[PDB]
Structure 1
């Protein structure tokens, strides 16, 4: 960011003005610029800048993680969270994956919210893990969540306890949704069981109004929302699940995910839901571990 006191120990405000005087205002400005020239120009000690460069790099630059360390860590950290639909967990290779943004693309009434609730209901009860359902279309209905939990468990209290773990937060504009994810990300950083599943229903609901016209700010907000989802998923190790609308291609005339081509690179795993009343087809439109094209029947009434 901007060179200021408290950004690094030993960084006095007196020299910060001196660095500004040579058009060095940012962290990348100080690191990139030749410090030997600045040390002579500003009168600042060269050993100080070299020490100042190292501490700034050690604070703002990500550090490489060895694959062996990451493999052992992800072995006991990543969790395959069952969606409660045995005919879909087979498609997802035993279910959802933490650390990935899973997208559930489909048309209206294709079961996108319904499968998301089952993911929320199963994680809330079966795995006893809290869920943050960020609904933008108003899809979540607490009666349906109770109805899903009633089928799984007949205990009066366990249904309420599972519902207690599902945190429903309503965000209908992009900035509200960005605020919720950032507020959640701060909550996880400051920590009682934390949030393990984040369900966004739907991303296309808030991003589609942004898209349109010569402005590219909608794409930036989309990618910033995409960045927030992936920071929640990969950094915080929670199974982020998002919901997307379906659209027909202008040229090829085939079903593709909405929010343009830029959003198509966002999710690690994508599930396509299309009607073949409750039977649906779940086609793995995008996967990082399984072939794309496999489709399995998914019935809503079995859940």
Structure 2
């Protein structure tokens, strides 16, 4: 806790904080770490008021553990199923995508990560009729492709016009801009708890590697902390507010010593919940929209299954 303010907890006065900060104990952490008896009798303060203040301070700052069954019945209805257009992951994901998890796609140049993001966003916005927020960091969005994708499913101008206005796009090219955008989204959705419509349910980040890649390198440590903080806030957003978050990434060394692995080192590997490794086919059948999709990490189903996805003829 910082400086004393009125309304933080009942029964606070300036004498209490003056004596406590004179006794080298101001913050809540060391006040609760120190024995209540020690500060109670050593400083001579009243025991009843002290214990009441400590209990009311912990209660208003804590998270009370809850039973499991009740939250299970509530999550039975809180969750949702989002389909993109292919069932390769759908069958291997307990027959439905999870709203409230951190899934991501790792793919190289020309793999089709942003194509998957675009088609998924179009399907979510048009078919299911919910607002969706898209974050771009390398100029990978073009509205003409969105219009072309929408036209492949509808032939009415009014539906195309209405669908576009529910897709919100914001440009962030530095990690601070991305953090500010996500914090603003968190604040706005926290203020919009009363409302039932207009709240975005799917959040897409076009490229998390490009923003944070310049921050890596050297022998320093602030880049790892920044990326960990970004991951933590993304996870808190997705869990607490029940949003589906999708991000992209790149691959690393393909040499003999190191297999094809996602970028951002080992620390980023623990962040996401689902991994989809897009790839291109070789030999006959190459080029076009023919891309091989695989599921590396799911933590819910067996992995190592390879499928086929076409984009050129899809939408």
TM-score > 0.5, shorter chain as reference: yes
Aligned residue for 1:282, secondary structure, equals strand
The structural deviation recorded for 1:14 is: 3.4
Which structure has the highest strand share of the two? 1
The structural deviation recorded for 1:268 is: 0.9
Residue 82 of structure 1 contacts residue 94 of structure 1 at CA under 8 Å; is this kept in 2? no
Residue 85 of structure 1 contacts residue 118 of structure 1 at CA under 8 Å; is this kept in 2? no
Residue 117 of structure 2 contacts residue 204 of structure 2 at CA under 8 Å; is this kept in 1? yes
| TM-aligned CA distance change 1:17 to 1:85, over 3 Å | farther
Moved more, 45-54 or 223-232: 45-54
Aligned residue for 1:286, secondary structure, equals coil
| TM-aligned CA distance change 1:124 to 1:19, over 3 Å | same
The structural deviation recorded for 1:130 is: 0.9
Residue 91 of structure 1 contacts residue 295 of structure 1 at CA under 8 Å; is this kept in 2? no
The structural deviation recorded for 1:90 is: 4.2
The separation in 1 between residues aligned to 2:254 and 2:67, in whole angstroms, is: 42
The separation in 2 between residues aligned to 1:7 and 1:54, in whole angstroms, is: 13
| TM-aligned CA distance change 1:15 to 1:118, over 3 Å | same
* Structure number, greater radius of gyration: 2
Moved more, 40-49 or 213-222: 40-49
| TM-aligned CA distance change 1:39 to 1:141, over 3 Å | same
Number of the residue aligned with 2:48: 47
Q: Structure 1: which 5+ runs fail to align?
A: none
The structural deviation recorded for 1:50 is: 1.5
| TM-aligned CA distance change 1:248 to 1:39, over 3 Å | same
The structural deviation recorded for 1:150 is: 1.3
The separation in 1 between residues aligned to 2:225 and 2:153, in whole angstroms, is: 41
Q: Structure 2: which 5+ runs fail to align?
A: 282-287
The structural deviation recorded for 1:18 is: 2.2
Number of the residue aligned with 1:114: 115
| TM-aligned CA distance change 1:31 to 1:86, over 3 Å | same
| TM-aligned CA distance change 1:250 to 1:25, over 3 Å | farther
Number of the residue aligned with 2:186: 185
Residue 89 of structure 2 contacts residue 295 of structure 2 at CA under 8 Å; is this kept in 1? no
Number of residues paired by the alignment? 303
Q: Deviations over 1:248-288 (max 9, x none)?
A: 26773211111111011000111111112211111111102
* TM-score, scaled to structure 2: 0.90
The structural deviation recorded for 1:40 is: 2.1
Residue 101 of structure 1 contacts residue 267 of structure 1 at CA under 8 Å; is this kept in 2? yes
* TM-score, scaled to structure 1: 0.93
Number of the residue aligned with 2:290: 279
The structural deviation recorded for 1:122 is: 1.0
The structural deviation recorded for 1:94 is: 4.5
| TM-aligned CA distance change 1:251 to 1:87, over 3 Å | closer
The separation in 2 between residues aligned to 1:275 and 1:99, in whole angstroms, is: 30
